[PDB]
């Protein structure tokens, strides 16, 4: 559990997803991760992994606050230059048993 490492998610919607750790807070309360969302944004409810885009989402509604390349929405969804930077919970992420392949090196 150190920055610039490769970790995988176990529970929640992020089943068997490979991610990368960029920075760790000195308080070790929460950790920042590079990941791809699997939510529908409240339209399919009464999905595969694909890169996030910041323009098709701004029309459905909600509290959206854009200040250029920086966006905030739906409970502080930290975003910059079209990429999500929200933090993860340590129990849901597993550090060992990842062993990343070259394809991961091209995603982030």
């Amino acid at each position: 559990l150190k920055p610039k490492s490769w970790v995988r998610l176990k529970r929640g919607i992020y089943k068997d997803d490979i991610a990368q750790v960029d920075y760790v807070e000195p308080s070790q309360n929460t950790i920042s991760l590079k990941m791809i969302p699997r939510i529908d944004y409240d339209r399919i409810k009464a999905p595969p992994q694909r890169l996030f885009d910041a323009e098709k989402i701004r029309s459905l509604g909600g509290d959206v606050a854009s200040d250029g390349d920086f966006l905030i929405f739906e409970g502080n969804r930290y975003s910059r230059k079209g990429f999500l930077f929200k933090s993860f919970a340590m129990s849901a992420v597993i550090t060992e048993g990842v062993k990343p392949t070259l394809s991961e090196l091209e995603k982030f």
Binding site: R43, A46, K56, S59, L60
Partner: protein, 42 residues
């Protein structure tokens, strides 16, 4: 609004906004009471 054979098969409808995005959808599944409630929800 789209449908099928209807023999024990529901009717589905989707509201699409002017941009082409879709809003929340509605499911519309002796007959008089069922059709009356379907009409009311519609």
């Amino acid at each position: 609004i789209a449908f099928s054979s209807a023999r024990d098969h529901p009717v589905f409808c989707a509201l699409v906004n002017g941009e082409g995005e879709v809003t929340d959808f509605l499911r519309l599944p002796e007959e008089r009471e069922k059709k009356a409630q379907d009409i009311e929800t519609l």
